[PDB]
RNA sequence: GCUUGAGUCUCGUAGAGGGGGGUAGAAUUCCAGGUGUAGCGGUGAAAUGCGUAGAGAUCUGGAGGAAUACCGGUGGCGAAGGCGGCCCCCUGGACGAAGACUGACGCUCAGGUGCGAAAGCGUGGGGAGCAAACAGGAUUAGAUACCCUGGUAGUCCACGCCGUAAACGAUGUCGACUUGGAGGUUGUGCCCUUGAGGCGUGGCUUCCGGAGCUAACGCGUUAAGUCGACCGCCUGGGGAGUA
């Protein structure tokens, strides 16, 4: 599987987030790995709760699209990068 | 001058490889040079001066 | 274009005087002869535009000359227009 | 009214036809009231590069001032014959004799 | 365009041929004709030294 | 009424002006045959990818269309688009030498006819290589980007439509004058080609540089100078050559 990726950010607006999701769809059903690059701008360090909820919503958007393997534990740098895997055909 | 049959004088103005010397090195008037090109290629058509020693 | 002997024939037969080539009469006659001959060449190939330019130029020259002659005198214009068989 | 210079090619082993060949051209052009000036034959000479096999073909020289139609049909005669090879003709520039 | 030299060099030392390449004429003739551009040899280097 | 403005004949000169018909060589592919077992491929980004019933290599013959190596150098031609193998036929302009000849017959042009590179569309024909769309691999934070391997329309021919470009010398045309220089090129003068020197007496073109203009850069006898005859065009940027 190749390595494909698009930028992320918790506070991203609506429409471009959905186009990004559809692009990730096309890539997954064309067999591409899931990588996340989310850049942290300034004082985003005081929104842990809403950030966690937004990340959970992002993953929930892939409820019937793929399968989750790993969940973040620790932080090295400004971001945590997780890998998602294609869903077994049913 | 304008003739083509006198291959003997025409020979010294061409290279052993079959190419033609430019008028810059020779130092001749341009109209003479074009008349010379006319004569040499007319000879080339009639199979007197080879295109090159390739064959 | 026009051969020398044809020019001599036309100037001798049609001109007013001997060596009278300056007259507009011979000008018009020679121009008409040349254009009538060139009708044959433009009867074919229908694309030689770079001489269509010259044909148009000489047609315009004939037009201007004939206009000037008609403006100056009537009798010579009538004689020309009847003898040569043009314009109509 | 219009000069022409003519030289053509001919097969080397076919040198036997050359006399009658040039005779029938000269008879045709004389019937065409042409004015000949000089004749010459350089003979067979090795050529620079082989063309359709063959080597050392035979040459010819003519000279004539004449109308156009006649050179047209003699060019056609050069055309359909297969015992003849490359034929070339120049235009006017008047007439010059000698020059072997 | 031709090389008929000896063993020792074997590497580069043809940068003189790079200078003699004249990238303008090759880049001009490889792609289409211009008829007004190879003039760059003159009339725009010496004649445009503006201060 | 008159020739200085304008036009004609005598001879000659240069030239890749156009149209139509043949011919030739070198080079790519495809075909046959002879000697014969893995290459072509950014390999400083890295390899896939395909060629493996006899090939890249080398010879001997055919098929096949396309474009014409050095000459070629703003050197030449044209109203601007533009023009390059060689042969033949029809044909257009320019210019020179001194001769005669008609006697203002001119200049400019709103609407109108003509021409107008390459992409496009319609009828067919043709297809060597080429390469928009697509096909596959590498490519990184990120490629539906170029890099590589293939690959249709279309570039070619014969008839028709299409009227636009940075169609720029970014300088509409036609006249009469005003300081200089080293060239390319074109035909005649009487000599003194006799060496390649003296008449430019002309035409078309290069490159520097005064007086004079120019906001400046710079233009600078082919003016952006001093004058004349006309035409076409301009009044802040977006909204816009849009509705």
Curated annotation (Swiss-Prot), chain B:
Keywords: Acetylation, Ribonucleoprotein, Ribosomal protein, RNA-binding, rRNA-binding. It comes from the Bacteria. GO terms for biological process: cytoplasmic translation; translation. Disulfide bonds: none annotated. One of its GO terms (cellular component) is cytosol. GO terms for molecular function: mRNA 5'-UTR binding; small ribosomal subunit rRNA binding; structural constituent of ribosome. Binds as a heterodimer with protein bS6 to the central domain of the 16S rRNA, where it helps stabilize the platform of the 30S subunit. Belongs to the bacterial ribosomal protein bS18 family. Part of the 30S ribosomal subunit. Forms a tight heterodimer with protein bS6. This is Small ribosomal subunit protein bS18. The chain holds residues 20 to 74 of 75 of the full protein.
Swiss-Prot record, chain C:
The keyword Repressor does not apply. One of its GO terms (cellular component) is cytosol. Keywords: Ribonucleoprotein, Ribosomal protein, RNA-binding, rRNA-binding, Translation regulation. InterPro entries: Ribosomal_uS15, Ribosomal_uS15_bac-type, uS15_NS1_RNA-bd_sf. It holds the Pfam family Ribosomal_S15. Disulfide bonds: none annotated. Induction: Part of the metY operon that extends to pnp, also has its own promoter. GO terms for molecular function: rRNA binding; small ribosomal subunit rRNA binding; structural constituent of ribosome. One of its GO terms (biological process) is ribosomal small subunit assembly. It comes from the Bacteria. Part of the 30S ribosomal subunit. Forms a bridge to the 50S subunit in the 70S ribosome, contacting the 23S rRNA. One of the primary rRNA binding proteins, it binds directly to 16S rRNA where it helps nucleate assembly of the platform of the 30S subunit by binding and bridging several RNA helices of the 16S rRNA. Binds to its own mRNA, stabilizing it 5-UTR and preventing its translation. Belongs to the universal ribosomal protein uS15 family. This is Small ribosomal subunit protein uS15. The lineage of its organism: Bacteria, Pseudomonadati, Pseudomonadota, Gammaproteobacteria, Enterobacterales. The gene is rpsO.
UniProtKB/Swiss-Prot annotation, chain D:
The keyword Oxidoreductase does not apply. The keyword Cell inner membrane does not apply. It comes from the Bacteria. One of its GO terms (molecular function) is small ribosomal subunit rRNA binding. One of its GO terms (biological process) is cytoplasmic translation. Keywords: Acetylation, Ribonucleoprotein, Ribosomal protein, RNA-binding, rRNA-binding. Coiled coil: none annotated. GO terms for cellular component: cytoplasm; cytosol; cytosolic small ribosomal subunit. The modification N6-acetyllysine is found at residue 93. 5 different forms of the protein, varying only in the number of C-terminal glutamate residues, were isolated. The sequence shown is form bS6-6, which is the longest. The first two Glu are encoded by the rpsF gene, the other Glu are added post-translationally by the RimK enzyme. Binds together with bS18 to 16S ribosomal RNA. Belongs to the bacterial ribosomal protein bS6 family. Part of the 30S ribosomal subunit. Interacts weakly with uL2 in one of the 3.5 A resolved structures. This is Small ribosomal subunit protein bS6. It comes from Escherichia coli (strain K12).
Swiss-Prot record, chain E:
It comes from the Bacteria. Belongs to the bacterial ribosomal protein bS21 family. Part of the 30S ribosomal subunit. In stalled ribosomes contacts ribosome rescue factor SmrB. Keywords: Ribonucleoprotein, Ribosomal protein, RNA-binding, rRNA-binding. Probbly involved in recognition of ribosome rescue factor SmrB in stalled/collided disomes; fusion of protein fragments to its N-terminus decreases ribosome rescue in the presence of SmrB. The lineage of its organism: Bacteria, Pseudomonadati, Pseudomonadota, Gammaproteobacteria, Enterobacterales. This is Small ribosomal subunit protein bS21. GO terms for molecular function: rRNA binding; structural constituent of ribosome. Residues 43-51 have a biased composition (Basic residues). Transmembrane segments: none annotated. GO terms for biological process: cytoplasmic translation; ribosomal small subunit assembly. The gene is rpsU. One of its GO terms (cellular component) is cytosolic small ribosomal subunit.
